[PDB]
């Protein structure tokens, strides 16, 4: 079954809200994000749902995701990709994400965040 089913709607929503609480405290990232992260988190949940083989919530609403393009306006450094990743690792610790679903998600996120570097 789809890897999204190994995490689910509730835990995914908690992973992502936790993540954006950390982003909002992270001095390198907070400046380049919106001041209000309410909408970003809503869109990452849709996106992460799609990314984990669940319904394509993101495309359905915003269109074709082409993330590297959507990210190009912003100054994504290697060191910023690393802060995002660090925030995300911490967020996973907090919700107690573990095992093969943590390995699959995070391993993919690592490859994606580096592909965001511009």
Q: Which residue has the tokens 């100054």?
A: 75
Residue 73 phi/psi, 5-degree rounding, is: -55, -20
Residues that bind ligand HEM (CB under 6 A): 29, 32-34, 39-40, 43-44, 47-48, 62, 67, 70-71, 74, 76, 80-81, 84, 109, 112-113, 116
Residue 45 annotated as part of some ligand binding site: no
User: Is the C-alpha dihedral spanning 117, 30, 59, 47 positive or negative?
Assistant: positive
68 lies in the binding site for Cl ion (CB under 5 A): yes
- Binding-site sequence positions: 40, 43, 58, 71
**Chain residues in the site for Cl ion (CB under 5 A):** 67-68
């Amino acid at each position: 079954n789809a890897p999204y089913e190994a995490i689910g709607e509730e835990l995914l929503s908690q992973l992502v809200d936790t993540f954006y609480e950390r982003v909002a405290s992270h001095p390198l990232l907070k400046p380049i994000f919106p001041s209000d992260l309410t909408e970003t988190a809503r869109k990452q949940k849709q996106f992460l749902t799609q990314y984990l083989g669940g319904p394509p919530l993101y495309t359905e609403e915003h269109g074709h995701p082409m993330l590297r393009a959507r990210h190009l306006p912003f100054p994504i450094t290697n060191e910023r990709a690393d802060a995002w990743l660090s925030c995300m690792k911490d967020a996973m610790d907090h919700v107690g994400l573990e095992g093969e679903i943590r390995e699959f998600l995070f391993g993919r996120l690592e490859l994606t965040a580096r592909h965001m570097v511009n």
